[PDB]
Amino acid sequence: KDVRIARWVATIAGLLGFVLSVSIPLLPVTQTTATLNWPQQGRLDNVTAPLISQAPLELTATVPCSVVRDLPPEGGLVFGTAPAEGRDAALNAMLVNVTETRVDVIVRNVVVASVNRDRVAGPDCQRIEITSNLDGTYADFVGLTQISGEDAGKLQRTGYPDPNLRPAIVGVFTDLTGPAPQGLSVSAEIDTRFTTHPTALKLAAMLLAIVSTVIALLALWRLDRLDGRRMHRLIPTRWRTVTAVDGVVVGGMAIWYVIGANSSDDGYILQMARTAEHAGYMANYFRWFGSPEDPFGWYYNVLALMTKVSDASIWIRLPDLICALICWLLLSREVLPRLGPAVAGSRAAMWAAGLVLLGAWMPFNNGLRPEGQIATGALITYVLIERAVTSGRLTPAALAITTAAFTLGIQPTGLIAVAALLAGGRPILRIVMRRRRLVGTWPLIAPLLAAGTVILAVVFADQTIATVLEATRIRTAIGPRVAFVFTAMCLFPSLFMMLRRKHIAGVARGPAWRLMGIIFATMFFLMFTPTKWIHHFGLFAAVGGAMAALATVLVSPTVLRSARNRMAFLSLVLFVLAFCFASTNGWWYVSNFGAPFNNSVPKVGGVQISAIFFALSAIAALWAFWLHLTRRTESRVVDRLTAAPIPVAAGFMVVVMMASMAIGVVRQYPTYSNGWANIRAFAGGCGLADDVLVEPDSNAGFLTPLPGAYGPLGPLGGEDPQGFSPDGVPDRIIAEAIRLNNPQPGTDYDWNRPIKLDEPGINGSTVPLPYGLDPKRVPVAGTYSTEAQQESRLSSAWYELPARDETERAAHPLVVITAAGTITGESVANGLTTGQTVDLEYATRGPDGTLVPAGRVTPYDVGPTPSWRNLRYPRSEIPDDAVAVRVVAEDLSLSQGDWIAVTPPRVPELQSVQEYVGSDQPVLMDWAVGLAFPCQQPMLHANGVTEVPKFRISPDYYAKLQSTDTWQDGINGGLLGITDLLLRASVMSTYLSQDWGQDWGSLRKFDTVVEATPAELDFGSQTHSGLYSPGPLRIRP
């Protein structure tokens, strides 16, 4: 017979799936082992090898005694794991130095083996053995002994047991030259516990597990088919017909996909995905020491396989569109009819569902973070559980358990899906205790275990359990957007109306209560979550639309035979809308450019709009009170107003968002907008790089001074300069920064530079200059003083503008003046910045062959005050009769903090970012700017080692200072330790093509402290047990 066959098959297949799937984590795996030796080509030349883990698994080194005899009297590095002139190299690295009397080994601010030099060069000493491993950091000087102290007579071994004392390796640097001596050699064993590939056994077990689970579910299907019920071959009318709500939702989703905003964590996911295939494992790439997101990481591998085609924004986030359409179909054609005949008979409920799904999908679930996919999985789970309860079969329950497992394996906030299994638990238990009689217990229970457990074969493919435990150890040791509450405003009324009246005429109790309990359970899980509650709201997009479709029926006049309650509900909706129109931080970093309200709350007329909604709420509530006092019923006006409040509210918010985005596009057309760039991607577009402009050499367009008799200030002051002095700038003023006395991460080389220069400029200046300006070609004038103050003027010489041509005039849209002080100028974030006057006065050549002025131009001064920053003067605001131009500066403030400093102007020689950086140079793109710079190549990493970057792109000042500098600091596991220790940064002069007051971000050039070349690593392989760990990593002292 076939029933007994299917029983046996189900049992054996499910048990095998459970066993093998539990065993996948503990099974062996092949790891590639890299190691690094510094003398490579038999010559003493420096070498770079930036480890992303900021420490090796072990280090050994051997140094003869003769090398000390070869250096000069003032020797230096015999070797070091970072350059001696680097930033905090003596705090983060190993250094073997010779200070003219002592041969010192300095591990991180710790002096191990400090020994005289006249002994090491003697005839007794032979070698120096240095070893840093988990057992400690020790150094032995063979042939010698301790002469002084309590340790006298015993060997010259010295050091400390501390596994957190292992150095940070970004190379092997020295000061020696020539051939290599016999014995000098280091050996670093790099940590590569994450980059692996499976054995044949593990792979075969995973494949057999998936096959057996499929076999078991097929056999359980053949067992569920024992009842005479069948699926009819015809499709129903609802899946065949099409409506207008379908068109509205689909069109809105498409238009928002192209034109609309994007989430905040996009570059995070994109850079992880792009670097995963070269690495060999999904790394976070910004934090936590190259540790993976592998326990919740398979969607990222889907994105990584997608990146092999293109990295555009219109392709990599197609899953959002797919999942949106799937949610809409499953919600309109499987969720609403099963709630009852009332729902799916009305149109208002369908409009409510569609519009709420739109409004919740818009700010959050358009991007790359998987919140919308989680919502889709939860909806699929609910649908399959309801189909199981209705049809009485157990296969959709198993498929729903599988879907819940995967939805949890996307992101830890997928536990919402599991809530469905907690709601539809007792029905499935009833089914199991009902079918236990006909067929036994194990044929049913085994496939469910196999379904729940098959996720371990996908989640632990390229990883083991020890790696995951280590990654969690690091993540726990180190630390860790319009408001929408349609969810709550729809959960409260449906809840109270299901509690008030027991049974509703034409509505199902079970499905509604299950949906409501799902939502309450996940809100419970989320209030315990340390992250802010409002950020995780895209999970309630589809289920929230379902609850809205339910709520629009439980408040209509067909059930609520009282007007006062409906007016109260209207007051509630309007109060909610006011609370959502007030609390809005804005949009995030590229959608907030052309939006109407960028630095305020909405304000039309003469007072904010939230006040108008609170006022409408007040009228509604007082009207309800009057209805209560007149004790009337069934007034036609209320039946006209309270026909459908929720769809009207949702449509209002939808139209608001779409209008904001379309206004941002039309107001900001030729330069960057999300929609314009995405439309441009089909034609070879590259995003913000196409619009952003940069000066390769920031001294290229300095204008020629006309002839004149001038003073010691030079041509810049001019014929009566008062209160301006060439060295009139404070000690430490730098480019786009403030130079706090205590340091910060991710800072340029200008911070730690000296105060004064060794050689003065043309005029008697000593001030450093920001953007690579050579003080032998660029004068300065400033008014800061310390003995007594005075009112200061400056009116420079007429600087001859270049020429009168059209192509040149098109390529040269600016005249720029570098200045530091409190200067007035327009902007976007904060317009009309009050302060002192630095203006650009232009001329028109008279008929006598002589000059005479016409007017002035006011700048666009974006950037931190009182930093060295570029002041922008467009050439569109200048008449084409212009031939000459001068600076006019006034200081009418006797306070010691209101000071001015200026340089001469320049018509820069610009070009785009894509024309200079290209798509082959490595770049350190922060986690905010990856979706606008897709064509740029990030700094990959493979086998523990990274690539030395040549550039760094970053967001605006406050975001760089508050978000990225702190996230990927070296103390927390980021990449800026490597760059701060190995490289020296310098900020560049960048502009945006037609928004001269917008702060798109910053571009920084990296230069090398010392000349060096990449390393030739040595490879091998080892097979592990699955539970193997070579001790813990270094994360903390």
Ligand SMILES: CCCCCCCCCCCCCCCC(=O)OC[C@H](COP(=O)(O)OC[C@@H](O)CO)OC(=O)CCCCCCCCCCCCCCC
């Ligand atoms: C990767 C994501 C794939 C999602 C699949 C969703 C398909 C939805 C649209 C299909 C068109 C159907 C037209 C049939 C028209 C039709 O006859 O309706 C098919 C059936 C309802 O059938 P009838 O209406 O004939 O049912 C009898 C009733 O009329 C009487 O009550 O609806 C379903 O069961 C749909 C749900 C399938 C869901 C299966 C999902 C299982 C795979 C899980 C994927 C996991 C994703 C992981 C997380 C991201």
Ligand SMILES: CCCCCCCCCCCCCCCC(=O)OC[C@H](COP(=O)(O)OC[C@@H](O)CO)OC(=O)CCCCCCCCCCCCCCC
């Ligand atoms: C009831 C059964 C339902 C179907 C269950 C899924 C079927 C199995 C398909 C994936 C097995 C993994 C691939 C083999 C594993 C293998 O042999 O290669 C393991 C491979 C090791 O490669 P290396 O470490 O050399 O490099 C990989 C790197 O290049 C990328 O990280 O790592 C991967 O590529 C990670 C796999 C990502 C997996 C992406 C797929 C995620 C599942 C998508 C389907 C989920 C929805 C299911 C609907 C219910």
Ligand SMILES: [Ca+2]
């Ligand atoms: Ca791997």
Ligand SMILES: [Ca+2]
């Ligand atoms: Ca002053």
